[PDB]
Structure 1
């Protein structure tokens, strides 16, 4: 069980090159099942879920190869069932369903949590596919979809904003007959990237990034080359790393417009920020951050995946600031660990009241959530002494070699094997 041993305090300064977003690469890799011609997906990070996805695609008959790119040939997909052993570690496997039924008229995906009645994430995917004309059967541990001929466009009102179901419905709609209009569509940049990838293959999609997406179906999709957009949360994490350590950083291979709310909140904390077409610079001019108010909400508002990192920023800031979590009004496990490093905070309801302190102290800490865990590593970089962050494989599933990128910024950090 790997751990990171960090020695602080260190001012983090320099540059970092942002990896492609795993959360955009995943939906794009599943959407590639729709492609009749070869596809090259560029800037794909090397992370576990990408490997899991490639193995699942291969089981369906797809030919897949990878390096920085992932090359796909789905011309001969010939098995339309995603089995239990290949889906059990990744809920995103459900994204194979829509493309399979849309292209081949049938598909099925194993459900590890069962088919028992009650409300589940898969419900909105089923809802949308049934609106497009698919018959959905929940039998023998699978969700199975089928349709005679092509799906048919429909006006679909999602009663909850859902990235997963938005992707399923938008992707399947690309091959339906007619027009599909998705209301209350998720607006995430990863949805916009998936939409633009589909358009690159020949789909017709507009409104992506807004609450309403319109897809005009076509008979078949082709192939091409598409580059996955930068990971905005990895970017935010490194910006916060500089913001809490009196540092200065330039993030390369970045996309500023995916972080409007984050950059505005960092400017409130006193950061001097500039942006270019593909870079963001942040400079604290050696100053401690000023406390800020944070309220998470659906994109384009402040992202819940940056909440832990901004909780840490407030805990070393000047002033009392409040973090309100509306998405997972209970994602606060980083708080008790930061208190053990000297932070002052009280969790009340779905909020954390932060009273900033000048300096944290090293401690042995651990969190399962990868953003809370990454926040603990950043805390170790600025705390006095030695910090040991345990179970960092969680971080490894979402960040490529974070210790190397942090070391390039001046951190004293070492990956220790089995302690």
Structure 2
């Protein structure tokens, strides 16, 4: 089990190039099942789920290959079933359902142990496709969809905001007969990116980014070249890296408008921030951060995927600050780990009261959540001594070569193979 051995303290400063967002690349890759002509998806990070997705698409009859781009030719897709062995490691596989039923009138995806599709009183993937006219069956370890003819546009009200189901419904609606209006739609930048990709193929969609998305169905989608947007969470992670170490960093290949809440919170912490069309610079001017108040909420509000990172920021800041989760109320496993590194904090209900200390101390730590794990690596960079972060494969799956990026910023980090 690989680990990262980090030697601190080190100021993290310089430049980093932000990779494409896996959370946008995945729905775009599945949306490509709708394309009748070749598609080139650019700026796709090299991460496990991307490979898993390519293997699944191939099984469906898609011709795929990759490098910086992933080239897709779904013209001859002829198998409409995503098997257990190809989906067991990735829940995103559910996104094959909508496109398949919308373009070929049928589809099915295996549901492995731990998969909660159909378990909610109202599963929005199922609800949305049913509203569009599909008949959904949950049988023999699969979720199956079918429709006689084409799907039909409908006014669909999502009873909860769901990025997952918004992608499913929006994607399938592009080939439905008529207009579909999605109310209470997820507003995440990845939804916007998926919508713009579909439009690039010839789809008619408006309202992406707002709580209401309107799709006017078309007979077919063609092809095109589309560049995946920057990973806003990776960006925030590196901005935090500089913010907690007195450094100055410039993030290249970034998209500032996906991070309004995060940048505003860093300014409250004392960061000197500037932005350009494709870059963001953060400069602490050698100063320790000031404690801030953080409250996670649905985009465009402060993102829960940056919560662990800002908890770390508060734990080395001047003053007492509070972290409040309204999305994942017990997403605090990074706290006990940081406490073993000398951090001072109390977890109370859905909040963490942080009492910032001047310097952390190295320890052997581990968190299974991707963002928490990355935060522990950052903590090791600024702590006094040696920090060993275990099970870093979790990071490997969500960040593209974070080791190389941190090293180029000044980190003393080494990947170690099993103890």
Bucket of the pairwise TM-score, normalised by the shorter protein: over 0.9
TM-score by length of 1: 0.99
Q: Which moved more, 1:107-116 or 1:332-341?
A: 107-116
Once the two structures are superposed, residues 50-99 of structure 1 have per-residue CA deviations (whole angstroms, 9 ceiling, x without a partner) of: 00100000000000000000000000000000011111111100000000
* Mapped partners of 2:111, 2:120: distance in 1: 11
1:184-199 aligned at under 5 Å gives the runs 184-199=184-199
Q: Which moved more, 1:142-151 or 1:236-245?
A: 142-151
What displacement does 1:123 show?
1.3
Match of 1:120, SS?
coil
2:142 aligned with 1:177, yes or no? no
Match of 1:213, SS?
strand
* Mapped partners of 1:114, 1:303: distance in 2: 25
* Mapped partners of 1:380, 1:113: distance in 2: 35
Q: Kindly indicate whether the alpha-carbon contact (under 8 Å) linking 2:43 and 2:69 is maintained by their aligned counterparts in 1.
A: yes
* Mapped partners of 2:293, 2:376: distance in 1: 21
* Mapped partners of 2:412, 2:88: distance in 1: 37
* Mapped partners of 1:328, 1:246: distance in 2: 30
Q: Kindly indicate whether the alpha-carbon contact (under 8 Å) linking 2:91 and 2:115 is maintained by their aligned counterparts in 1.
A: no
What displacement does 1:139 show?
1.4
What displacement does 1:121 show?
9.4
| RMSD, matched Cα | 1.2
What displacement does 1:120 show?
3.3
Once the two structures are superposed, residues 357-415 of structure 1 have per-residue CA deviations (whole angstroms, 9 ceiling, x without a partner) of: 00000001010001000000000000000101010000000011111100101111111
* Mapped partners of 1:72, 1:84: distance in 2: 22
Once the two structures are superposed, residues 248-279 of structure 1 have per-residue CA deviations (whole angstroms, 9 ceiling, x without a partner) of: 00000000000000000000000000000000
Match of 1:255 in 2: 255
* Mapped partners of 2:92, 2:114: distance in 1: 16
What displacement does 1:113 show?
3.6
What displacement does 1:144 show?
0.7
2:148 aligned with 1:151, yes or no? no
Q: Kindly indicate whether the alpha-carbon contact (under 8 Å) linking 1:315 and 1:343 is maintained by their aligned counterparts in 2.
A: yes
Q: Kindly indicate whether the alpha-carbon contact (under 8 Å) linking 2:189 and 2:258 is maintained by their aligned counterparts in 1.
A: yes
Once the two structures are superposed, residues 227-267 of structure 1 have per-residue CA deviations (whole angstroms, 9 ceiling, x without a partner) of: 00000000000000000000000000000000000000000
Q: Kindly indicate whether the alpha-carbon contact (under 8 Å) linking 2:314 and 2:356 is maintained by their aligned counterparts in 1.
A: yes
Match of 2:69 in 1: 69
Q: Which moved more, 1:378-387 or 1:133-142?
A: 133-142
Match of 1:32, SS?
helix
Match of 2:398, SS?
coil
* Mapped partners of 2:349, 2:150: distance in 1: 48
What displacement does 1:205 show?
0.2
Q: Kindly indicate whether the alpha-carbon contact (under 8 Å) linking 1:115 and 1:139 is maintained by their aligned counterparts in 2.
A: no
Q: Kindly indicate whether the alpha-carbon contact (under 8 Å) linking 1:114 and 1:141 is maintained by their aligned counterparts in 2.
A: no
Q: Kindly indicate whether the alpha-carbon contact (under 8 Å) linking 2:118 and 2:126 is maintained by their aligned counterparts in 1.
A: no
What displacement does 1:140 show?
1.1
What displacement does 1:112 show?
1.2
Q: Which moved more, 1:119-128 or 1:189-198?
A: 119-128
Match of 1:341 in 2: 341
The 1:364/1:129 distance shift into structure 2, 3 A limit, reads: same
* Mapped partners of 2:293, 2:114: distance in 1: 40
TM-score by length of 2: 0.99
Q: Where in structure 1 are there 5+ consecutive unaligned residues? A: none
* Mapped partners of 2:333, 2:233: distance in 1: 19
The 1:116/1:71 distance shift into structure 2, 3 A limit, reads: closer
Match of 2:123, SS?
helix
The 1:89/1:332 distance shift into structure 2, 3 A limit, reads: same
* Mapped partners of 1:415, 1:366: distance in 2: 14
Q: Where in structure 2 are there 5+ consecutive unaligned residues? A: none
2:280 aligned with 1:267, yes or no? no
Once the two structures are superposed, residues 197-216 of structure 1 have per-residue CA deviations (whole angstroms, 9 ceiling, x without a partner) of: 00000000000000000000
Q: Kindly indicate whether the alpha-carbon contact (under 8 Å) linking 1:271 and 1:282 is maintained by their aligned counterparts in 2.
A: yes
